Design a protein around this ligand. Structure first.
Ligand SMILES: [K+]
Ligand SMILES: [K+]
Ligand SMILES: [K+]
Ligand SMILES: [K+]
Ligand SMILES: [K+]
Lengths: 90, 90, 90, 90
């Protein structure tokens, strides 16, 4: 489960990184950052400057948000929770 | 279900696109982008400049957020999930 | 239920409107807009300029987000849903 | 439960405050504000300027969001709810 969600999220982020670095001309790290803050809905970034960037962002959000949060929801419940939960056992 | 949510979301976005392009004077693509990042709570955009824009955005958020996420929640569970889930069957 | 959540949300927004208009010197409409985009996590606005603004925003977010989304969750399920749901009956 | 979530959230915020004040050179209050708006996904702030800031923010979001919202979810259901709920008893 966690393994699959991790892969799907990585591929989704790779796609966004490639898109934004090419169309918006961002350095890879910036393109990945943009992709990440977009899909987690944090949004700490100014918007894309090109229409392609805007259209892709619209579609990228609708298709990638469900996945990203599904992953986050498992990362904290099936992994981070026990780590400290089972650790809460005297 | 997915069909209905898709329609309600499209109409909600069309309304926002028409509103922002008229009142804020944005090109259609920008008005749609603004509507989308607003309702998905991504918020990668500077705020509206007019009071009408601000008031509408306030109301648009409260009335459209529940719908948009209801749609996203079905798009990833009733459509995108199986696509890869059933595909996870040897 | 919806009645109570509506009141609690209105009071929460009134408080934020009064705070931001006084401490950040924003016109009432702007202070309300800021309060709304903050609590719905949309965040389409530059940050407060004063330390009081920042500290209050930190606390305002933790105390008001649960309430605001509880309201939104009822506004779309107990009110907006049937309106179109029962209307989906031939 | 609430006690544990409160601690984990405080430590998560302390870490972010120390990181951003050191790497991005922000005053402590600004570093805490940035950490808070990032993890609650409010995002009312311009992005970090350094690559370290961006990389850390990416990881900080994935590891801290689940926790922060788990805390918020308990703060409004196990604490703020009754306060007004039990108070709704004639
Ligand atoms: K958000
Ligand atoms: K959210
Ligand atoms: K934002
Ligand atoms: K923003
Ligand atoms: K946001």
């Amino acid at each position: 489960e966690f393994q699959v969600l991790f892969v799907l999220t990585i591929l989704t982020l790779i796609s966004g990184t490639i898109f934004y670095s090419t169309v918006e001309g961002l350095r890879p790290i910036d393109a990945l950052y943009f992709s990440v803050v977009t899909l987690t809905t944090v949004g700490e970034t100014p918007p894309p400057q090109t229409d392609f960037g805007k259209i892709f962002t619209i579609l990228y959000i609708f298709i990638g948000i469900g996945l990203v949060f599904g992953f986050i929801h498992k990362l904290a419940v099936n992994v981070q929770l026990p780590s400290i939960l089972s650790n809460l056992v005297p």
